[PDB]
Amino acid sequence: PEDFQQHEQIRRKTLKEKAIPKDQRATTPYMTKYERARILGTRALQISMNAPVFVDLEGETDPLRIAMKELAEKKIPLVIRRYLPDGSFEDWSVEELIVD
Amino acid sequence: PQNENARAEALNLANTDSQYLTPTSGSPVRGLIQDHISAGVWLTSKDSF
Amino acid sequence: DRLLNSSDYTQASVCRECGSILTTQQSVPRIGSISTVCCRRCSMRFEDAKK
Amino acid sequence: MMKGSRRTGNNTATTLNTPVVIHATQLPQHVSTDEVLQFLESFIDEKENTNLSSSISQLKRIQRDFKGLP
Amino acid sequence: NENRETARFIKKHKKQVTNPIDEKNGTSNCIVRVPIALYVSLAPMYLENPLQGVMKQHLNPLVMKYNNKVGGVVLGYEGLKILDADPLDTSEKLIKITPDTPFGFTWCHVNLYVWQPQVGDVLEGYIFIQSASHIGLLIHDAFNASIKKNNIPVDWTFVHNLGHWVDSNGEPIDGKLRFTVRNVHTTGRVVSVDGTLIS
Ligand SMILES: [Zn+2]
């Protein structure tokens, strides 16, 4: 009631500190081959649990091959949280990157 | 392996085809070894008709 | 996978004041009560109830 | 064993049962009869357009408690 | 030494906002609003409709059970407010997937209305039935109450049969009854209420 007020004020301001917006972000505009892994895991890990599938899957049982059919059409609704070792981060959607 | 965050890694990170060059000095580690190498200099020879 | 999810994947209980794992405990309920989770060293007995 | 194994369904608290941390962000403030019965007119109109069929009836009894007669 | 460490315990249990004796009905005021913050676990199948997934999985089983954090039976809610993890209000907010699950957790503000019983309260509700050693009640058509002979004076006897009540006026007693609430005991799943009569 009063000391969680002195706990969410501190935290979300500290969470507001280390964000780097779309004009200040200067890391790589590529998908760095581990991003392509963990997307194709966790996107396929959602589709196994009856998450909505934004592609016309045509007789595919593997969540992995289904998730590689959404990445080929830039359909995956994930946002990559690229940390920097000070603690800061830059937020990157799947749509604005280039899959090699 | 037992979940789908790992099955993608075994197909994309630590698969064999991406491990074509060694990460030591960039030399290849795949390749045919004994049978076909000495066999291939007979099919590529000029008398193969 | 190979050091938690397929060797000793355990979901224990942690008290979020004293910071322990062993000293958490499922409560032995009263015969109409519901077995909750209570810790040990954050727990002091009822005898210390001065005013 | 026979009593200790079904206590996983006694609590039956996954993350799909309970929220993890429950922190009241502000102080408790009382709501009067003109506000409760307008809350119970507003919210119960929303959940009637699934389960929760038991607790809707339980709040209809509190609704009729401030507008009618048992 | 052990005088300021006890304040960690005195401030621990004692609720702040009292139940003032309002509108001179004899009843105090016990329906109280407080806003909270959950910590949800949104389903993968409720990715398309994430407002319906937070309410159905964590808020529809939240009403009409006694809650050990607010200290009250949750009467009702309204107004979910899912936060965001991008500190940019708008539609496409974004939540954070746990690394091992497809379940992504987030923060939500939401507003509750509960029932607030305390000590020192005086309330009024209908009596259902009674006995020669206890009298049970109903409050707000949701809430039990029981008044027993260890809360009842001596000269109030009992006409015997359903046997009705005999007060010092010699009458079977009516439905609505003023009573003082004793310690509340939440042993069963049904929220049990104890009460007294004498001042
Ligand atoms: Zn401990």
Question: CA end-to-end span of chain D, whole Å?
Answer: 47
Touch test A–D: 3 Cβ pairs or more under 8 Å: yes
Gap from B31 CA to chain E (nearest CA, Å): 37
Residue E177 in contact with residue E165, Cβ under 8 Å?
A: no
Reading the block at residue D32, the tokens are 């009067």
A12 closest CA partner among C20, E84, E19: E84
Say whether E15 and D28 touch across the interface (CB within 8 A): yes
The whole-angstrom separation of Cα A98 and Cα A28 is 10
Gap from A50 CA to chain E (nearest CA, Å): 5
**Residues of D with CB below 8 A from C37's CB?**
11
Separation of CA B25 and ligand 1 centre (Å) = 52
The whole-angstrom separation of Cα E112 and Cα C34 is 24
Exposure on the CB side of residue E101, measured as CA atoms within 13 A = 12
Residues 6+ apart with CB under 8 A from A23: none
The whole-angstrom separation of Cα C6 and Cα A33 is 25
Touch test A–C: 3 Cβ pairs or more under 8 Å: no
Domain extent at residue A5: 1-100
Which residues between 23 and 52 in chain E have a beta carbon less than 8 angstroms from any beta carbon of chain A?
A: 34, 37, 43-45, 47-48
Touch test C–E: 3 Cβ pairs or more under 8 Å: yes
Q: Which residue has the tokens 């003082």?
A: E180
For the purposes of burial, counting CB atoms within 10 Å of the CB of E151, is it exposed (0-12), middle (13-18) or buried (19 or more)?
Answer: middle
Separation of CA D20 and ligand 1 centre (Å) = 20
Gap from C48 CA to chain D (nearest CA, Å): 28
Domain extent at residue D6: 1-70
Length of chain B: 49
Q: Which residue has the tokens 């993608």?
A: B8
User: CA D13 → CA A65, D10, D51, E101, distances in Å?
Assistant: 34, 9, 18, 17
The whole-angstrom separation of Cα A73 and Cα D11 is 44
What kind of experiment solved this structure? cryo-EM
A94 closest CA partner among A81, A78, A72, A73: A78
- What's E52's domain CATH number? 3.30.1490.120
Length of chain D: 70
Residue A34 in contact with residue B12, Cβ under 8 Å?
A: no
Q: Which residue has the tokens 């997934």?
A: E53
Number of domains observed in the structure of chain D: 1
User: CA A90 → CA A22, A35, D43, E178, distances in Å?
Assistant: 8, 14, 40, 63
C/E interface, count of CB pairs below 8 Å: 8
- What's A12's domain CATH number? 3.90.940.10
**Could you tell me which chain A residue has the CA closest to the CA of E109?**
A8
Say whether A44 and B13 touch across the interface (CB within 8 A): no
DSSP labels for C4-41? Answer: TTTS-------BTTTTBSTTEEE----TTS---EEEST
Report the neighbours of C using a cutoff of 3 or more CB pairs below 8 angstroms. B, D, E
The whole-angstrom separation of Cα A69 and Cα B17 is 21
Reading the block at residue E184, the tokens are 């509340």
Task: Classify A7 as helix, strand or coil.
Answer: helix
Q: Which one-letter amino acid corresponds to residue E87?
A: P
Task: Classify E81 as helix, strand or coil.
Answer: strand
Task: Classify E60 as helix, strand or coil.
Answer: coil
Residue E69 in contact with residue E113, Cβ under 8 Å?
A: no
Residue E155 in contact with residue E198, Cβ under 8 Å?
A: no
Resolution value (Å, 1 decimal) = 3.5
Separation of CA C18 and ligand 1 centre (Å) = 5
**Helix, strand, coil distribution of chain B in percent, nearest 5:** 35, 5, 60
Tell me the pairing of strands E122-130 and E143-148. Answer: unpaired
DSSP labels for A81-98? Answer: EEE-TTS-EEEEESTTSB
Radius of gyration of chain C (CA): 16
Gap from D57 CA to chain A (nearest CA, Å): 31
Q: Which one-letter amino acid corresponds to residue E125?
A: G
Number of domains observed in the structure of chain A: 1
Say whether E16 and A1 touch across the interface (CB within 8 A): yes
For residue E192, what is the DSSP state?
A: B
Residue D44 in contact with residue D28, Cβ under 8 Å?
A: no
C/D interface, count of CB pairs below 8 Å: 8
